[PDB]
Design a protein around this ligand. Structure first.
Ligand SMILES: CS(=O)(=O)c1cccc(-c2cc(N3C[C@H](c4cc(F)c(F)cc4F)[C@@H](N)C3)ncn2)c1
Lengths: 726, 726
């Protein structure tokens, strides 16, 4: 029969997945951008209109990579001159377009090299960060109001996060939060003054005669962390002659006693904001609820209104404490916390009451709270069919927790077992996004009766195309390690024959709270390996995995590099015993945390694996950042966990690599997992006389995602795997 | 028959070459160190005595890596705490041992971290450099005299060379020169104030949490060069309260007009010193002869006594203008210069006469002047048998240039065709060092009649050992490219059969004035490749090669990366046509300049080569240092030679690498050929979609010579070559 899914198909993206990215602008309408122009859709009937023609900016004179329409509908923020920084951060130039007078605003424009910009929640106010300082614009064409003056490159950050906060706690560059109606603008300030710098070379274009040395404040495990402060400013009480006044919100006392972090800020009402703080020993977190004092101007956070969230088995939250969802009056809220049984479920709080009431329970977990009406609470969980790798939308009646309704489970159980959702402003309508096991399916629904309004995108075009190619299949199942079940998935070659013995590749990540076994549909390298090369690509979620309760997730607490790598070995051991696996050809590969695990496995001396590839792996935890490492490892001091820090390195296992074929890959400009980590691995291997393969990627970071580097690394890795298996 | 010469033999040095390193202390005696103690030998009779027992320093409390006996015989300088810097530079601790009172001097000792130390030519005076300043010690136990105060790390160097002067012009760290009887101490001062810095990471031991950034003043092609000044101080006119007075010798005017270098300093007499200066455009050099003015204290360099040495076909000298050899009265001198025919021969000068008289001539070259008596001039050349890859000692009668006698040619023409020599103080005796084609042979001779006194070392032990192993053979011959003959050598596998077709590896260097085809005996990687793997390892000396006249050497003037790489291709092309070469398996490899050539060849699109290895290659000349690059390339400016600078890069040929298997290797701590050079090569290959192999060596420099890295790189390269050939 026809052709298979080739490497070129993957690298050249011959089989494209269609999406349906919409942006709700009201409770009844959403904007649906296209290649050319933006349309506005009526959710109820489905009729649309052109919001603005593609031609509108034919002669803008700049390539626009992104737009942003004020909640007003009145203005359009045009982003261009994009220059990526870290995972989320970047700088760009901005122009505002008046949709009213259809004129491009040319006076008092936003400066170039702006670090961040955001419209207020309602009007058309603007808040942006430039040169590490915050600026507010009440009107697009009016002069800016400077809010901060302490901004200082690599030292003081106002309104934006520093390297570690961007990557580890906020997953964003932005560090500013508008109040609901736009009156107040809250923000955090980070001080990196004494944070050590990581320095590495950047070669740039061939014409650069001397390499440049990049240096960024980066706190490695146990090093000096950046400090943080929080402020709130009334954007309605600013002159044009008076330097704005930011009111600081400090403490709590339980946090100030030592190193700590700001891990969450969520507005409750127009005059109430909630803040969550975490101790450097991410065992203990505290939430403060603060109110604006009218005839005083300051903010007060009544103790008694603060809630403590701690863990005795591990750290707090999956990656960081969950965000609260306040009721209309801000007098109560719902937030996901760990059960007394170790499972994450929704707990209901009264802002001034210590104990909360769990509204959901069971041996499954709530992934997230998606919407909250006065009537219901909508959330996504993996309860359905008891499979932790599945996701479905559910709604629970606030009047009776007994009444929970699954809104996605039965829509199409064969094709859809993994959903994400997007609600309109007042949750009157919602879009469901099915991403597997079948082809992605996007639909619209109305909340009143949960009626399906219509299909938005069903990827029928991709479907027709794929029936002419021998596609691999996916098996999602579990095995049983002493009492507990652990899930795994296998990308099976077309025409799988359980009678035959196939070579197997263990695709691994295995970081804390990770999940590599799910019902998501994917077209990746594994697809090619199975379809064209007839290689089985498996993934296993062992100890340390997430979404299955803390007994499993917290198993590797203070013990990274132990049970999670061991279970990976044990899984392969069980796979090679299912009958369709050639135990003479079992390989393993991983990126990031998976690179670390891959390396630890290859250096375990288990003998189970013939070869393996590690891409940008961590080699010893003292080299990785403080916020992430310490969360699971504690401090690298003899009084705390130094011994295990020293026992879990890859280099200490160098000798065992004599029994395997290892390929080490790393980008030279990796600001996240520093090239240093692989430099130390290679050195320990050389010092022990172990031969291996290596490949550096000049000027590529942790993603090694530039077009050319991407195709090149996957091509290099394909040759390596085939050589090992053929 | 028995075994072959294996990789392990090479890496573990199972077959050791014996040497006979002696150190003349007089015109009749020499010191011959041993593993344990130092002996003193009488050259005439051969009888010896113990100069000092090994036990002498049993409880010194430090490992002594080197000794240095004052020309006095009175003191012994003990060097320990050695810490290597660049190719020649390093720091160490020193202790002086009084051989008279057999006591270790403990007062006013030389400081630790001393950069350089040297005894005066006769007495026991000491001159050392510490913290970039010069210090003189008239007596080992007496306080030091500070000579300079401008010393400043990475900025001002007194008595020592900066990075580029150490590597490119003086081939030494030392930048100070004692006068004949020790009265005067001359020295150079280097200013790196505005020299750009090369910065790169050094990872150090696993325990280093943050990598360190190394920065060294390094002028890349066309950048700002360091400036130099010269001084002479009378070490007999120093108090202990008065700051010493250094008399500066400036100019010449023809040099001061622009950028220039100090390329040689040679004392003529007790009160006369010669200096050679070179313009940044190393086309023109000027020699100054300066005399000490008694009743004035300063030094005067009479114009009329200065000699200009320039070249119209290329640069001056092989690497730098040759050194002069003055007659007893310092009124005349002999120095090697290029012929009117382009061949380097000895020219005789009268210090105050413009034109010199050539005392030797012919289509061969004088390699170096080894000794000068009032009677004869001893020199080494490649005249014998007309083979430029051979070396022999000759003596020419100063009274009649017609009388030239070869002193080594016939000693043992079968085993010895490559000699080096070592004369006693007054050239009364000399040791000959035969290094090929047979096993190294060391002998002693007396100059009066050139009588052979006795054999010092004949490597008979190694000889007995090697007759039990299938050793490869070496073929030295030449081919003819349009009128001119170009030499090559081939390491042939044991039992070579011209009827069989062997795979061939082109071992290449090819830099300007290089020679890879000679009669030297070697036990290296090539030995293993031929003996055990039956691979022919050839080397070719094409355009640009040295020791054959300027028509050949200067052929690549201002044109690096052209004829020298082309001829390498042409050679392989002719080798694959000799009948015993499998043209389907021809590879090429090189280090340093040879890495550059290897890369240029592999990217030439010739198709002649299947695979190739480049170790620490230069990729584009603007990345290499000024002194070396500019000597052959001129300046990288549109007014000079920028176009060719841009036309001779490796990356510009990236596309052509699709036809070959390439292995790129480079040490991350390469202070000479910066990792940057390979980083840019890999990047251009990735951008073009070319797959290749790579290997970085963490913390290794240009030599990748640490024990573990050395074994590892040659092991990695052996696998690569075998895979390409098998
Ligand atoms: C006889 S002498 O007159 O004492 C005298 C003096 C002063 C220098 C010399 C000399 C210098 C030399 N080199 C080669 C070298 C080099 C070239 C490359 F292309 C590289 F990629 C890396 C390199 F290290 C460069 N760094 C200097 N090779 C031989 N002889 C010889």
């Amino acid at each position: 029969s026809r052709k298979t899914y080739t490497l070129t198909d993957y690298l050249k993206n011959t089989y494209r997945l269609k999406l349906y990215s919409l942006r709700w602008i009201s409770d009844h309408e959403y904007l649906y951008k296209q290649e050319n122009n933006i349309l506005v859709f009526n959710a109820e009937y489905g009729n649309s209109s052109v919001f603005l023609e593609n031609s509108t900016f034919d002669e803008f004179g700049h390539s626009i990579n992104d737009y942003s329409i004020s909640p007003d509908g009145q203005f359009i923020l045009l982003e261009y001159n994009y220059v990526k920084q870290w995972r989320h951060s970047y700088t760009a130039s901005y122009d505002i377009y008046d949709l009213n007078k259809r004129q491009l605003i040319t006076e008092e424009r936003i400066p170039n090299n702006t670090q961040w910009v955001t419209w207020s929640p309602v009007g058309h106010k603007l808040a942006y960060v430039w040169n590490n300082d915050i600026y507010v614009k009440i009107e697009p064409n009016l002069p800016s109001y400077r809010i901060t003056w302490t901004g200082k490159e690599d030292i003081i950050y106002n309104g934006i996060t520093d390297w570690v906060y961007e990557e580890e706690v906020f997953s964003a560059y932005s560090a500013l939060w508008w109040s609901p109606n736009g009156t107040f603008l809250a923000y955090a300030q980070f001080n990196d003054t004494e944070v050590p710098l990581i320095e590495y070379s950047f070669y740039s274009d061939e014409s650069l005669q001397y390499p440049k040395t990049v240096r960024v404040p980066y706190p490695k495990a146990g090093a000096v962390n950046p400090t943080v402060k929080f402020f709130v400013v009334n954007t309605d009480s600013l002159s044009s002659v008076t330097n704005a006044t930011s009111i600081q919100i400090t403490a709590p006392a339980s946090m100030l006693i030592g190193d700590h972090y700001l891990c969450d800020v969520t507005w409750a009402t127009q005059e109430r904001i909630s803040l969550q703080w975490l101790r450097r020993i991410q065992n203990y977190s505290v939430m403060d609820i603060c109110d604006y004092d009218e005839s005083s101007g300051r903010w007060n956070c009544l103790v008694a209104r603060q809630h403590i969230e701690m863990s005795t088995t591990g750290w707090v939250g999956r990656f960081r404490p969950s965000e609260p969802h306040f009721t209309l009056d801000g007098n109560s809220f719902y937030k996901i916390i760990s059960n007394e049984e170790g499972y994450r479920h929704i707990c209901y709080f009264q802002i001034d009451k210590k104990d909360c009431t769990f509204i959901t329970k069971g041996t499954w977990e709530v992934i997230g709270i998606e919407a909250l009406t006065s009537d219901y609470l909508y959330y996504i969980s993996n309860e359905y069919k008891g499979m932790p790798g599945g996701r479905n939308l559910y709604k629970i009646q606030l009047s009776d927790y007994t009444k929970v309704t699954c809104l996605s489970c039965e829509l199409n159980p064969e094709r859809c077992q993994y959903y994400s959702v997007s609600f309109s402003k007042e949750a009157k309508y919602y879009q469901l996004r099915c991403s597997g096991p079948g082809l992605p399916l996007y639909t619209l629904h109305s909340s009143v009766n949960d009626k399906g309004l219509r299909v938005l995108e069903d990827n029928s075009a991709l479907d027709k195309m794929l029936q002419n190619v021998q596609m691999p299949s996916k098996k999602l199942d579990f095995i049983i390690l002493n009492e507990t079940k652990f899930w795994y998935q296998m990308i099976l070659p077309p025409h799988f024959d359980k009678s035959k013995k196939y070579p197997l590749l263990l695709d691994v990540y295995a970081g804390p709270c990770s999940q590599k076994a799910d019902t998501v549909f994917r077209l990746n390298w594994a697809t090619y390996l199975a379809s064209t090369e007839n290689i089985i690509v498996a993934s296993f979620d062992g100890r340390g995995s997430g979404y299955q309760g803390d007994k499993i997730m917290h198993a590797i607490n203070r013990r990274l590099g132990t049970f999670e790598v061991e279970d990976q070995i044990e899984a392969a051991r069980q796979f090679s015993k299912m009958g369709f696996v050639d135990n003479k050809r079992i390989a393993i590969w991983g990126w990031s945390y998976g690179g670390y695990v891959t390396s630890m496995v290859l250096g375990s001396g288990s003998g189970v694996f013939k070869c393996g590839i590690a891409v940008a792996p961590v080699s010893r935890w003292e080299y990785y950042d403080s916020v992430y490492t310490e969360r699971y490892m504690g401090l690298p001091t003899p009084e705390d966990n130094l011994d295990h820090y020293r026992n879990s390195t890859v280099m200490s296992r160098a000798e065992n690599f004599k029994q395997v074929e290892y390929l080490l890959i790393h980008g030279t400009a990796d600001d996240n997992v520093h090239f240093q980590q692989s430099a130390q691995i290679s050195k320990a291997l050389v010092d022990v006389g172990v031969d291996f393969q290596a490949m550096w990627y000049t000027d590529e970071d942790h993603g090694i995602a530039s077009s050319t580097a991407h195709q090149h690394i996957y091509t290099h890795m394909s040759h390596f795997i085939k050589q090992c298996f053929s």
